[PDB]
Subunit: 326 residues, 4 copies
Amino acid sequence: STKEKLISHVMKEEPVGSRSKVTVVGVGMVGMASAISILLKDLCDELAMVDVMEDKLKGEVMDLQHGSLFLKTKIVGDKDYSVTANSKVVVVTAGAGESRLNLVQRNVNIFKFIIPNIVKYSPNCILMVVSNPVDILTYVAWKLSGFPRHRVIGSGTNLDSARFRHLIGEKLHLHPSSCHAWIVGEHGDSSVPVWSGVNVAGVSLQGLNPQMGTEGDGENWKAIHKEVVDGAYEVIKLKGYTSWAIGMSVADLVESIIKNMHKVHPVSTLVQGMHGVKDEVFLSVPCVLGNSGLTDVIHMTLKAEEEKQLQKSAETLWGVQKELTL
Amino acid sequence: STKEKLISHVMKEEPVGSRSKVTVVGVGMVGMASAISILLKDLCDELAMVDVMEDKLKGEVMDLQHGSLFLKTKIVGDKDYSVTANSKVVVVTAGAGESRLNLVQRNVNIFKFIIPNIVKYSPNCILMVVSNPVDILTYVAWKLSGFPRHRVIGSGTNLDSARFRHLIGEKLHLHPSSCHAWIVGEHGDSSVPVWSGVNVAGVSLQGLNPQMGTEGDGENWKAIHKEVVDGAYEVIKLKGYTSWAIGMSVADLVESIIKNMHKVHPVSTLVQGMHGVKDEVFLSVPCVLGNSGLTDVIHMTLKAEEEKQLQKSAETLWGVQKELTL
Amino acid sequence: STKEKLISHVMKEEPVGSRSKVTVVGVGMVGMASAISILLKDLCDELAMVDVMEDKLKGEVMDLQHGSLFLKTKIVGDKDYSVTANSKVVVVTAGAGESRLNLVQRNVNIFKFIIPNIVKYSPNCILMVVSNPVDILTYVAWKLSGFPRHRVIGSGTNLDSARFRHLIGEKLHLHPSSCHAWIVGEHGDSSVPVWSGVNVAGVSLQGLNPQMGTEGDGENWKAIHKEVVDGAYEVIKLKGYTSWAIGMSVADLVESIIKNMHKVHPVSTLVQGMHGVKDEVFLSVPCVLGNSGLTDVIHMTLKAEEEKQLQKSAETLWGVQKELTL
Amino acid sequence: STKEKLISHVMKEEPVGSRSKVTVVGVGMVGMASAISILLKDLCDELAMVDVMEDKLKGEVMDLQHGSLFLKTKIVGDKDYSVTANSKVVVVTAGAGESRLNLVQRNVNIFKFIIPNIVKYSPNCILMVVSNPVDILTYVAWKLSGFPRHRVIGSGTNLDSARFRHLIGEKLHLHPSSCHAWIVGEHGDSSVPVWSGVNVAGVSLQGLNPQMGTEGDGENWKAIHKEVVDGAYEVIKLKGYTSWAIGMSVADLVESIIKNMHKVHPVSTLVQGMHGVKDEVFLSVPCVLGNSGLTDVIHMTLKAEEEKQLQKSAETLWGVQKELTL
């Protein structure tokens, strides 16, 4: 044949195979936005996709294969989980009148099928849980997977902190990366915007505006936080989905892991014994991320009323968790 | 306020404003895939979006604004075309039992509204036409815009040539960029896969397989070409749309223009007087692209039966064009 | 000829020419490290070099031209300053028993030849002064150039702040970008490490260690600062030059300008009227950078003894300046 | 301490350690240009340096450590080779009236110390030999290392082919990546510019100019080749060294290996049994590169007088080799 006339294999032993392999579970818009952001940034040597909707999957994966010229990653995708084998990272994005309990249980049924097959072909992978709710669901994945605490991570408040920095940048006319601000705790309505850490170039903003975040504030910084959390709702109440920002925040998280940067990200993780948290639950706090997974946590010096909010959420979170069939 | 306590403006004169501004017309999946690929690669200092579907637009643009932390481009989007002002590139992606004539006329009605508003706020912009059919539609945009030939470009056979190189890479187990092959002419069913230029490292493949592309071929290289053109149909017959590969091929085209690389891309452009083409029509041939737009065309040495295919398409293309209300 | 047989020019009007053009004045190791970092990161569409040592220049520029395949920038270099024409940014790196006064005057003689030729071919360029001393020398360039305050920038404490964040990252085992800390004022021995702004994820370090930076400190954070400033001396006392870190910090500064990011960098600029500074001198404070140049300055809330250090430096700086022949 | 108050380690087991580790042997300008290009492009998670000149080394490595903020790689450097442990790639750059025989033997003495220590801490590393002469020296490293053919690669004609494409781009006013041309065989004076493969967009140039490369050529294409090989000499006869282009060509080679791209590069490798080559020697031919190393070779269809040149070089190369003390 032509291939033979043209090429002679000069390697005796079997190829070592991919080494930065990432798998994205789920091909809804959140998976594809995660996948295309990962590919566009050259973060891994192989990207695998997986979902129960076989046709939808094959169309996504065929489409991305067709751009292989502008990329640097091998792309695979299949319904069988042997396609995900030997991943370093597995980003889980599969998802959901009705009760929160019960909406949670369904999402947990979904995880019951997925996790075992992931563990089966990627025993040493790091799980990065992305589907909502993320705090409880990272927990589910963690006990429902057997992995050591450090290999099970929830995306937590990463995007919201990003979104919070973006909104603060627009108010100030500064690029987002020059505005520093952190949102922690339970992702969504009950998250904690830590006003004492909001600074530009180490200059405390609350320092310049002591009422920042309170009812005495003449500039309604609290509404910015509310805007961050109403984020997904406003976008979906507009184009009927959310994806882009999340996908970019996923690739950001993944780059920190695969390049072993020891970078600090607000992500969801086991917080028992932090800030008075009694129960075994997951919440976002600043965490160190590398290729070992989540290696370290940062202890922010939180005021009493902020530790309190974190304790109340853990109770609400643990309320639901005790009701779960795992 | 806090901003004032913190920041003092030390520039007397008005800001010079964005200088690499790109606008993507249309927020279907092709526009967003073009937009997110452009943003992920840091290609411009401002990306603007525009579409008649105001709500859908605002949701897309709000979503991408929310990732501004991981990006380096200012993002705008509005229904009014003053938002597109001062673009360097305008990528047009808006689109369509029924006759091809009439499906074309509708797409041309769409262009009649769009083009004038684009020309109005970006008199010196380069148009890159992407919606199908692309050959006739780049033509429409060109006379319907008044721009000099070089500022009006059709994406032509860029992605298909890419897809062709990808498929050839999978057969050979080589990265796509090491397999060189060109598809020219009218985009779609009647395109020309130039077998004499198919090489790896300057080694002619047809040289090793003289029957390449013909009925005497023992390896059916012709079917690879057919696969490239059945591409969009197979993907859509699977996930119900196409986007990813096109978006990446758009950003590739845009990078070559904005960085002024004088790079060679197979794109659609005026071919009258090339290869015996009599009529005023657009087809893909290798073209030089820079920040001036499309500066040069390459004359491939085509065999007679390949010049013939290009002439027949131009007649079919000019058949439809003469019927158009412009 | 072959070119003609192969290519036909299809553009009637003159090319628009380069639009992100950067010029690096000086081909010592600092210029080349600036140039290669700028090129490796795709920041501009044309990089020009210039230096009085014609042969050395031509060898540097020929060498970088030879890698044009892995790059995306046009590369020029000449002794005549018409080669620098139409730059957006001009990074000035040309440089020097003896008195500081007199070492300064020589560097100022050097600037007297260079600046006028730069202004001549790039009337609207932004100057980024890099050679030491940088605070006085940015000043020299500014009055000796006629440009509005915002188009004249000194690299100030950018690298030192970077180096400070790197050293803090090694002590903490965190990536540099997760450790935030600022050094301001007069670059070198008398710079100010602002301990109140040193934080990881908004968590004040001085908050955890109240003695940070003082003689009561049980961890000698002051020595870290001293290490940052002894930086260039220790490296040169080892390999006989410094370049790499500076070059990377230059490209960082340049990217913020050319992509119009409105990002915050500690750079040297006019500080009269800031923090009790009476005299017309330049020092590093957090500054907003975009494609307009230096648009905004940040007012850090400095303690009295830190405003005092800045005032004393300005007097020492203005001591020398009043002695200069400009 | 502060670190403790701030950070709690939540990982029980030992970190997995770096996974894309590259080591550059040698801190002359070729090593640093290789190192800074590798770092600027985010290609590995750890870059190690090594050289017998301890002080020079420590100054280079300290300098690059100081830019860790703008980078994503951990940087190490030491005289002891345990610092190079667990590298995926080891780029060897250490180097040399007098005879070629004897200049070769000295370079081979140098390799005798280096190779064993490399093999000792990186038993499964891929060697990429860069120092001149490269063809014989890759050979030396190969038998003098014990590695399987595929883990021992010479940089061969990579840069020269790049330089050849750059020069062809300047003549044609096309970006280098759109001009395709290959130089093979023994690197330097006796290399083979394969005129039949010189094309733009699959269009044979020799096709348009049948005399290309010969004494009947009206455009002296042969002189372009001579210019490529006189490259290093002309640059050094100007600035007193060469580095930049080589460093960029090294990072290009390294990216293809670490991302497992299966990309085609003209590199030096065992050619016995190719094109009539009898002897055990190394020359450049198009080779497939991935994370397994050099997996495949391409058989170019060379005319008889081009196979002859390759055979004559192998004899000249094997002339010297038989004289070596290994």
